[PDB]
Enzyme design. Structure first.
Site, PDB file in Angstrom:
ATOM      1  N   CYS A 209      -5.036   8.517   2.723  1.00  0.00           N
ATOM      2  CA  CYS A 209      -3.774   8.387   1.996  1.00  0.00           C
ATOM      3  C   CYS A 209      -2.468   8.492   2.767  1.00  0.00           C
ATOM      4  CB  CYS A 209      -3.728   9.416   0.869  1.00  0.00           C
ATOM      5  SG  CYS A 209      -5.328   9.830   0.101  1.00  0.00           S
TER       6      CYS A 209
ATOM      7  N   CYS B  78      -0.170   5.352   4.006  1.00  0.00           N
ATOM      8  CA  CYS B  78       0.758   4.736   3.068  1.00  0.00           C
ATOM      9  C   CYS B  78       1.743   5.712   2.444  1.00  0.00           C
ATOM     10  CB  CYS B  78      -0.007   4.040   1.950  1.00  0.00           C
ATOM     11  SG  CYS B  78      -0.985   2.616   2.512  1.00  0.00           S
ATOM     12  N   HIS B  79       1.301   6.944   2.208  1.00  0.00           N
ATOM     13  CA  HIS B  79       2.154   7.933   1.556  1.00  0.00           C
ATOM     14  C   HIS B  79       2.874   8.919   2.464  1.00  0.00           C
ATOM     15  CE1 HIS B  79       1.078   6.626  -2.524  1.00  0.00           C
ATOM     16  NE2 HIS B  79      -0.173   6.502  -2.126  1.00  0.00           N
TER      17      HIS B  79
ATOM     18  N   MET C 180      -1.833  -0.070  -4.435  1.00  0.00           N
ATOM     19  CA  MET C 180      -2.581   1.178  -4.499  1.00  0.00           C
ATOM     20  C   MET C 180      -4.056   0.885  -4.776  1.00  0.00           C
ATOM     21  SD  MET C 180      -3.082   4.398  -4.496  1.00  0.00           S
ATOM     22  CE  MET C 180      -4.217   5.550  -5.287  1.00  0.00           C
TER      23      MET C 180
ATOM     24  N   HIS D 116       7.259  -3.051  13.672  1.00  0.00           N
ATOM     25  CA  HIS D 116       5.934  -2.744  14.162  1.00  0.00           C
ATOM     26  C   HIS D 116       5.772  -3.198  15.602  1.00  0.00           C
ATOM     27  CE1 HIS D 116       1.883  -1.412  14.039  1.00  0.00           C
ATOM     28  NE2 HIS D 116       1.374  -2.617  14.246  1.00  0.00           N
TER      29      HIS D 116
ATOM     30  N   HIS E  99       2.898 -10.670  12.104  1.00  0.00           N
ATOM     31  CA  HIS E  99       2.214  -9.721  12.973  1.00  0.00           C
ATOM     32  C   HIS E  99       1.910 -10.481  14.265  1.00  0.00           C
ATOM     33  CE1 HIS E  99      -0.968  -7.314  14.719  1.00  0.00           C
ATOM     34  NE2 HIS E  99      -0.549  -6.312  13.961  1.00  0.00           N
TER      35      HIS E  99
HETATM   36  C1  DHE Z   1       2.060   0.896  16.996  1.00  0.00           C
HETATM   37  C2  DHE Z   1       0.921  -0.041  17.272  1.00  0.00           C
HETATM   38  C3  DHE Z   1       0.783  -0.952  18.299  1.00  0.00           C
HETATM   39  C4  DHE Z   1       1.719  -1.200  19.452  1.00  0.00           C
HETATM   40  C5  DHE Z   1       1.249  -0.593  20.696  1.00  0.00           C
HETATM   41  C6  DHE Z   1       2.088  -0.714  21.893  1.00  0.00           C
HETATM   42  O1  DHE Z   1       3.185  -1.305  21.810  1.00  0.00           O
HETATM   43  O2  DHE Z   1       1.670  -0.214  22.964  1.00  0.00           O
HETATM   44  C7  DHE Z   1      -0.443  -1.631  18.106  1.00  0.00           C
HETATM   45  C8  DHE Z   1      -0.974  -2.647  18.885  1.00  0.00           C
HETATM   46  C9  DHE Z   1      -2.243  -3.170  18.879  1.00  0.00           C
HETATM   47  C10 DHE Z   1      -2.796  -4.157  19.759  1.00  0.00           C
HETATM   48  C11 DHE Z   1      -2.034  -4.855  20.798  1.00  0.00           C
HETATM   49  C12 DHE Z   1      -2.246  -6.034  21.262  1.00  0.00           C
HETATM   50  C13 DHE Z   1      -1.443  -6.660  22.306  1.00  0.00           C
HETATM   51  O3  DHE Z   1      -1.826  -7.733  22.797  1.00  0.00           O
HETATM   52  O4  DHE Z   1      -0.404  -6.091  22.666  1.00  0.00           O
HETATM   53  C14 DHE Z   1      -4.122  -4.290  19.452  1.00  0.00           C
HETATM   54  C15 DHE Z   1      -5.179  -5.105  20.147  1.00  0.00           C
HETATM   55  C16 DHE Z   1      -4.373  -3.483  18.307  1.00  0.00           C
HETATM   56  C17 DHE Z   1      -5.568  -3.385  17.605  1.00  0.00           C
HETATM   57  C18 DHE Z   1      -5.748  -2.908  16.330  1.00  0.00           C
HETATM   58  N1  DHE Z   1      -4.832  -2.178  15.645  1.00  0.00           N
HETATM   59 FE1  DHE Z   1      -2.934  -1.622  16.303  1.00  0.00          FE
HETATM   60  N2  DHE Z   1      -2.664  -0.482  14.609  1.00  0.00           N
HETATM   61  C19 DHE Z   1      -1.598   0.367  14.436  1.00  0.00           C
HETATM   62  C20 DHE Z   1      -0.598   0.637  15.338  1.00  0.00           C
HETATM   63  C21 DHE Z   1      -0.261  -0.117  16.467  1.00  0.00           C
HETATM   64  N3  DHE Z   1      -1.068  -1.103  16.997  1.00  0.00           N
HETATM   65  C22 DHE Z   1      -1.672   0.972  13.089  1.00  0.00           C
HETATM   66  O5  DHE Z   1      -0.972   1.858  12.646  1.00  0.00           O
HETATM   67  C23 DHE Z   1      -2.794   0.273  12.351  1.00  0.00           C
HETATM   68  C24 DHE Z   1      -2.097  -0.767  11.357  1.00  0.00           C
HETATM   69  C25 DHE Z   1      -3.668   1.196  11.581  1.00  0.00           C
HETATM   70  C26 DHE Z   1      -4.263   2.312  12.325  1.00  0.00           C
HETATM   71  O6  DHE Z   1      -4.906   3.177  11.690  1.00  0.00           O
HETATM   72  O7  DHE Z   1      -4.120   2.365  13.557  1.00  0.00           O
HETATM   73  C27 DHE Z   1      -3.441  -0.494  13.497  1.00  0.00           C
HETATM   74  C28 DHE Z   1      -4.658  -1.137  13.442  1.00  0.00           C
HETATM   75  C29 DHE Z   1      -5.295  -1.868  14.399  1.00  0.00           C
HETATM   76  C30 DHE Z   1      -6.647  -2.460  14.216  1.00  0.00           C
HETATM   77  O8  DHE Z   1      -7.338  -2.412  13.222  1.00  0.00           O
HETATM   78  C31 DHE Z   1      -7.014  -3.153  15.508  1.00  0.00           C
HETATM   79  C32 DHE Z   1      -7.135  -4.732  15.173  1.00  0.00           C
HETATM   80  C33 DHE Z   1      -8.281  -2.661  16.101  1.00  0.00           C
HETATM   81  C34 DHE Z   1      -8.268  -1.259  16.551  1.00  0.00           C
HETATM   82  O9  DHE Z   1      -8.618  -0.994  17.733  1.00  0.00           O
HETATM   83  O10 DHE Z   1      -7.912  -0.372  15.742  1.00  0.00           O
HETATM   84  N4  DHE Z   1      -3.226  -2.804  17.991  1.00  0.00           N
HETATM   85  C1  HEC Z   2      -1.666   1.830   1.022  1.00  0.00           C
HETATM   86  C2  HEC Z   2      -2.659   0.682   1.150  1.00  0.00           C
HETATM   87  C3  HEC Z   2      -2.111   2.930   0.054  1.00  0.00           C
HETATM   88  C4  HEC Z   2      -3.146   3.783   0.208  1.00  0.00           C
HETATM   89  C5  HEC Z   2      -4.195   3.728   1.306  1.00  0.00           C
HETATM   90  C6  HEC Z   2      -3.050   4.759  -0.868  1.00  0.00           C
HETATM   91  N1  HEC Z   2      -1.995   4.483  -1.713  1.00  0.00           N
HETATM   92 FE1  HEC Z   2      -1.430   5.496  -3.303  1.00  0.00          FE
HETATM   93  N2  HEC Z   2      -0.041   4.163  -3.653  1.00  0.00           N
HETATM   94  C7  HEC Z   2       0.284   3.047  -2.892  1.00  0.00           C
HETATM   95  C8  HEC Z   2       1.325   2.254  -3.539  1.00  0.00           C
HETATM   96  C9  HEC Z   2       1.964   0.976  -3.001  1.00  0.00           C
HETATM   97  C10 HEC Z   2       1.661   2.892  -4.674  1.00  0.00           C
HETATM   98  C11 HEC Z   2       2.569   2.378  -5.767  1.00  0.00           C
HETATM   99  C12 HEC Z   2       1.933   1.252  -6.594  1.00  0.00           C
HETATM  100  C13 HEC Z   2       2.815   0.785  -7.772  1.00  0.00           C
HETATM  101  O1  HEC Z   2       2.294   0.303  -8.800  1.00  0.00           O
HETATM  102  O2  HEC Z   2       4.053   0.894  -7.692  1.00  0.00           O
HETATM  103  C14 HEC Z   2       0.815   4.085  -4.736  1.00  0.00           C
HETATM  104  C15 HEC Z   2       0.832   5.023  -5.748  1.00  0.00           C
HETATM  105  C16 HEC Z   2       0.029   6.149  -5.834  1.00  0.00           C
HETATM  106  C17 HEC Z   2       0.141   7.167  -6.856  1.00  0.00           C
HETATM  107  C18 HEC Z   2       1.094   7.184  -8.032  1.00  0.00           C
HETATM  108  C19 HEC Z   2       2.510   7.483  -7.577  1.00  0.00           C
HETATM  109  C20 HEC Z   2       3.539   7.253  -8.658  1.00  0.00           C
HETATM  110  O3  HEC Z   2       3.300   6.412  -9.556  1.00  0.00           O
HETATM  111  O4  HEC Z   2       4.599   7.905  -8.598  1.00  0.00           O
HETATM  112  C21 HEC Z   2      -0.729   8.142  -6.566  1.00  0.00           C
HETATM  113  C22 HEC Z   2      -0.979   9.401  -7.385  1.00  0.00           C
HETATM  114  C23 HEC Z   2      -1.371   7.737  -5.344  1.00  0.00           C
HETATM  115  N3  HEC Z   2      -0.915   6.500  -4.909  1.00  0.00           N
HETATM  116  C24 HEC Z   2      -2.293   8.504  -4.669  1.00  0.00           C
HETATM  117  C25 HEC Z   2      -2.958   8.112  -3.530  1.00  0.00           C
HETATM  118  C26 HEC Z   2      -4.034   8.878  -2.916  1.00  0.00           C
HETATM  119  C27 HEC Z   2      -4.492  10.293  -3.283  1.00  0.00           C
HETATM  120  C28 HEC Z   2      -4.543   8.092  -1.944  1.00  0.00           C
HETATM  121  C29 HEC Z   2      -5.681   8.447  -1.000  1.00  0.00           C
HETATM  122  C30 HEC Z   2      -7.059   8.553  -1.643  1.00  0.00           C
HETATM  123  C31 HEC Z   2      -3.756   6.864  -1.936  1.00  0.00           C
HETATM  124  N4  HEC Z   2      -2.783   6.875  -2.915  1.00  0.00           N
HETATM  125  C32 HEC Z   2      -3.870   5.862  -0.986  1.00  0.00           C
HETATM  126  C33 HEC Z   2      -0.361   2.674  -1.729  1.00  0.00           C
HETATM  127  C34 HEC Z   2      -1.425   3.339  -1.167  1.00  0.00           C
HETATM  128  C1  LIG Z   3      -2.122  -3.156  15.354  1.00  0.00           C
HETATM  129  N1  LIG Z   3      -1.420  -3.843  14.809  1.00  0.00           N
END
Ligand code: DHE
Ligand code: HEC
Ligand SMILES: [C-]#N
Ligand code: DHE
Ligand code: HEC
Ligand SMILES: [C-]#N
Lengths: 543, 532
Positions: free
Chosen positions: A41, A44-45, A82, A321, A364
């Site tokens: 959670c 996103c939160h 959500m 990003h 992206h």
């Molecule tokens: C901040 C960030 C960067 C920039 C790094 C830099 O500038 O040095 C980056 C780059 C990257 C780059 C950079 C590629 C390049 O050519 O520069 C790759 C391969 C990559 C593979 C992935 N990323 Fe990434 N990535 C995140 C964060 C980031 N990723 C996340 O927060 C996210 C969305 C979710 C998470 O939990 O991490 C996420 C998921 C992923 C994947 O699912 C990928 C496809 C596989 C993996 O290993 O997790 N990220």
């Molecule tokens: C990003 C992909 C999310 C993840 C992962 C989780 N939540 Fe979430 N949540 C998200 C959004 C975009 C929204 C709003 C949706 C809308 O109709 O506007 C929410 C909302 C909730 C809420 C209600 C909040 C409110 O109405 O004020 C709850 C209680 C909530 N989400 C809980 C929650 C939990 C416990 C999660 C982990 C299991 C979780 N969310 C993941 C987006 C995302």
């Molecule tokens: C990693 N985006």
């Protein structure tokens, strides 16, 4: 495609008491709920429940909504983004209730991570004095590829011409990406857990010569790339705590920690959790380029003086990003993804020069793809996660004035769910993956456009489809193809066939001249291969 | 309201009602000394990890009977009822309350432009001598008095925020800016037939500093205000007070490099060498040089200095910022031209408190800047001339005693041969009601303690009722007369005393029923030009 903060969800916490109108959870129940919160959670939160992609879930808000409201929302979800944790079965009925109750309780307070903590984690395995003074192994270092073996917490060093896995190194936790020092000697890897490892490629048997922890959750790292500052510094950015750290490029000694907590650029409201996203290095000034996601600020940090620290805080667009420099290495083009915008910064003058909507959903680009379009001139391209479009932006203010910082063309590729677009100066092709596409046929393939055939008439350019996963002979599971990366000569491009950890994965090497299969890399050690980084192309920012 | 925290093992929980009641009391009465986040400041930290070890009984007793060191006896005095005390005791055992922020939305909501620039005079419409005017804080009345520097006539008394801390002037001398400790800013147009507030805005919940742009070419362009809470500073349009850029000061301490959730903004000055504001960030020990030429692509220099930065001033050349990191007894010197730290020196005294300090040419040492101390009777001199007197530059050249401890302000002027030093906080009425005056011309710097004349300021004012404290010397434009505030209680008699600088004799006593709790006094010319 939001962050899973697993490491934070490994930290046990003290269960808070329940105030008026709230039921308490035992330490066992609370910790169980806490683990779920950070693993599923918090992305996103927010770590502090202040809200990001998802709404804020702090007690002052949740208590007014009430248990029933929370329970229902977590169970059935909502179409706005959500997930339906309950009905999907992701979370059991008991877990859903734990989360609802958890949200009513005081938020856990994850610890800060300052200098004291960093120095304590700081370990220099081989002092600079004791390291080689010249390359001792016979590897072609510049053609080496550093590959993330995600779930195994390792990286594989693979030879660019023989495709031999030279070695598999452990870090102890899932690594996100690899970066190279400007000299190409040092390999830096950033673990999702905030662990930084520095590897000396000159050793007979390359391994970690220094390590340090810079936070609890991190995804970015970069090295100093201004001429004259080779190997001087490395910088790492964290999701939690919200900060970046400049380290000595030879020992990893933590030199300067900067908090990213601050005001959002537009509404100018205090934000307690601004995550550091991509970090690049300027080639025009001795500065690091730091993206601060939630506040929409791009920081140009001058590393010539860490005591009297000069920085330029550029108001950009929220939800920054990834991004890359244009072909001339002067302009930083980055995706403010949630708002479908590309922000352009002039690294020479240190100012924002443009913000343009790509016309697509959730750009992206990774570092993007630079090429000289036959009619438009120098352009930088990006694909999108939200749709099948590829957008081109002019990058030549002096030479192609009217085209500069304008979206010149937009056309479809394989389908939505794209993550990386790639090309090389020696290639006439533009490769676009579709990693997150729900259709296996699409997610396992790559679209390739012929740059030479690109006219500037508005019609959609045709593309060839390369059946990457099929070429690897992998059909089991959910094998998603991701990220093209070229070899030093730009004659071959590699793709990861990312499959489950208990499933078969592979790396596919494509002959850039013929667009035919060249070689398939398979090995029992090749667990969940994702990011791949060629030493030369990473050290020189060639993309 | 804030969401009441749950109570852990052994400690008692409060209803949302009770908690918020206790919360109100904390921020209104305790936060000032213990810090908004209970991390500690003037008072020790009251965070749970510490309070729980002390126990309910300890806390309760301490809040009721208090202590000598500075803790008010809330219970015994009656300030807080027995119930409120217990409520606070239980409150202190619970997790710290989440303080309210104050961003752009809140600022714009409080932002009011009473007279738009286009409706203001294009030339001075009154016949006052603006540059010789004094803006005097009538603290407890939430007003300021504009007083004629030559006739001593109170030209006007204007309503402002409560307990205005200081008055600052725009570089042209047309606009008067005042900021109350509450965070309320008032902008006054001195060119109006009847000067009054043309614009106002609130920038936080607790604030102390405000300054105007002083770089040549940037006259009247911007104003900047600093807040204690939230930890932030805001750059405003110099003509309308429109909030343009808000910057949080939350960050890392310069030395231990540990995150600090409450780095209060202390003194703010304006560079004469570059289009920048000079911002002291107290708890983190950072001095910020903020370039206001571009607020979108914001250039700043974050200088690691020393913790507990408070007040300070520029040297005579207006190139070097010398500031007191008071709790550490250090003077930090910044080169505003090069944008770098130049030196950090211990004054040899306890808690230096210079105000903006006093610059003068010492007969033997050459250009120097002086500061007195809150913790002792010492006056320290630091050399300020790297080019002409390199061996004396940034070195403490002398330290000598004045009237006594509890000093707050030291003062001189280029046309004066005297160095004035008050002793405002001294417990002894005879000392707090007087000022020490050293003859600069007679200073030899031979290591002996320079003699000083004691001016019986309070006695001259003809006030003995309720121990008035004399505070802050301020000169007129010509630097021929120096004013002192004779600060008494709200319901008591106060006065301003004007001293003839040439003879050190009484020139005039200013008394008026409207002169309630006079504290800071700022001459328009000396403030707009930073002449001190
Ligand atoms: C901040 C960030 C960067 C920039 C790094 C830099 O500038 O040095 C980056 C780059 C990257 C780059 C950079 C590629 C390049 O050519 O520069 C790759 C391969 C990559 C593979 C992935 N990323 Fe990434 N990535 C995140 C964060 C980031 N990723 C996340 O927060 C996210 C969305 C979710 C998470 O939990 O991490 C996420 C998921 C992923 C994947 O699912 C990928 C496809 C596989 C993996 O290993 O997790 N990220
Ligand atoms: C990003 C992909 C999310 C993840 C992962 C989780 N939540 Fe979430 N949540 C998200 C959004 C975009 C929204 C709003 C949706 C809308 O109709 O506007 C929410 C909302 C909730 C809420 C209600 C909040 C409110 O109405 O004020 C709850 C209680 C909530 N989400 C809980 C929650 C939990 C416990 C999660 C982990 C299991 C979780 N969310 C993941 C987006 C995302
Ligand atoms: C990693 N985006
Ligand atoms: C940060 C700060 C400045 C610099 C302002 C600037 O650069 O524009 C300042 C300056 C000042 C100056 C500046 C004089 C000058 O010549 O520049 C004056 C007159 C002044 C009157 C007082 N100050 Fe002040 N003052 C504080 C804060 C500050 N005071 C405190 O936190 C403190 C110690 C506790 C408090 O209760 O506020 C404090 C007590 C006092 C007083 O007791 C005074 C005497 C009266 C009052 O209303 O509080 N402070
Ligand atoms: C500044 C004038 C203060 C105000 C206003 C309040 N407190 Fe305070 N407190 C202050 C000091 C300097 C000290 C230490 C005094 C000493 O003898 O050393 C304290 C101490 C306390 C304590 C005890 C802390 C401990 O011993 O560890 C408590 C429990 C306390 N103060 C509570 C408190 C409350 C609730 C206040 C608002 C009603 C309050 N203080 C105001 C200084 C000042
Ligand atoms: C006021 N100090």
């Amino acid at each position: 495609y939001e962050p899973s903060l697993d490491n934070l969800a490994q930290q046990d916490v003290a269960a808070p008491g329940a105030p008026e109108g709230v039921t308490a959870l035992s330490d066992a129940q609370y910790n169980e709920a806490n683990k779920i919160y950070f693993e599923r959670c918090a992305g996103c939160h927010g770590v502090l429940r202040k809200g990001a992609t998802g709404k804020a879930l702090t007690p002052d808000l949740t208590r007014d909504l009430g248990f029933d409201y929370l329970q229902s929302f977590i169970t059935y979800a909502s179409p706005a983004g959500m997930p339906n944790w309950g009905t999907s079965g992701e979370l059991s009925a008991e877990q859903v209730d734990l989360m609802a109750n958890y949200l009513l309780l005081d938020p856990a307070a994850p610890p800060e991570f300052g200098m004291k903590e960093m120095r304590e984690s700081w370990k220099v395995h081989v002092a600079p004095e004791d390291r080689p003074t010249q390359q001792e192994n016979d590897w072609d270092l510049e053609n080496l590829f550093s590959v993330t073996l995600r779930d195994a917490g390792q990286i594989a060093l693979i030879d660019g011409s023989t495709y031999e896995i030279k070695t598999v190194l452990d870090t102890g936790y899932a690594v996100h990406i690899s970066r190279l020092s400007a000299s190409g000697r040092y390999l830096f890897v950033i673990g999702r857990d905030g662990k930084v490892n520095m590897i000396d490629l000159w050793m007979k048997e390359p391994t970690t010569v220094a390590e340090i922890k810079i936070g609890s959750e991190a995804r970015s790292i970069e090295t100093s790339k201004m001429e004259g500052w080779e190997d001087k510094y490395a910088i790492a950015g964290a999701y939690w705590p919200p900060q970046y750290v400049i380290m000595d490029g030879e020992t990893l000694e933590p030199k300067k920690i900067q908090s990213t907590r601050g005001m959002t650029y537009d509404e100018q409201e205090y934000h307690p959790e601004p995550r550091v996203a991509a970090i690049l290095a300027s080639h025009y000034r001795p500065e690091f380029i730091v993206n601060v996601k939630e506040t929409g600020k791009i920081l140009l940090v001058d590393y010539t003086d860490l005591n009297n620290l000069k920085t330029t805080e550029i108001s950009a667009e929220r939800f920054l990003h990834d991004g890359g420099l244009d072909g001339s290495h002067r302009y930083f083009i980055t995706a403010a993804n949630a708002r479908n915008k590309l922000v352009v910064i002039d690294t020479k003058e240190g100012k924002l020069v443009a913000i343009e909507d790509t016309g697509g959903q959730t750009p992206h680009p990774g570092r993007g793809a630079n090429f000289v379009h036959p009619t438009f001139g120098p352009v930088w391209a990006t694909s999108h996660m939200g749709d099948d479009s590829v957008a081109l932006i002019g990058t030549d203010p002096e030479g192609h004035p009217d085209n500069a910082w304008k979206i010149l063309d937009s056309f479809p590729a394989l389908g939505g769910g794209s993550l990386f677009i790639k090309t090389h100066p020696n290639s006439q092709y533009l490769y676009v993956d579709a990693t997150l596409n729900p259709e296996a046929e699409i997610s396992g393939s790559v679209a390739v456009f012929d740059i030479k055939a690109m006219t500037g008439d508005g019609s959609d350019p045709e593309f060839k489809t390369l059946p990457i996963a099929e070429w690897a002979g992998i059909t089991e599971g959910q094998p998603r193809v991701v990220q093209g990366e070229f070899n030093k000569d730009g004659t071959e491009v590699w793709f990861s066939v990312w499959n489950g950890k208990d499933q078969e994965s592979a790396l596919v090497v494509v002959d850039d001249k013929t667009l035919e299969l060249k070689h398939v890399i398979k090995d029992e050690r090749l667990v969940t291969p994702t990011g791949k980084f060629n030493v030369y192309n990473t050290m020189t920012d060639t993309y």
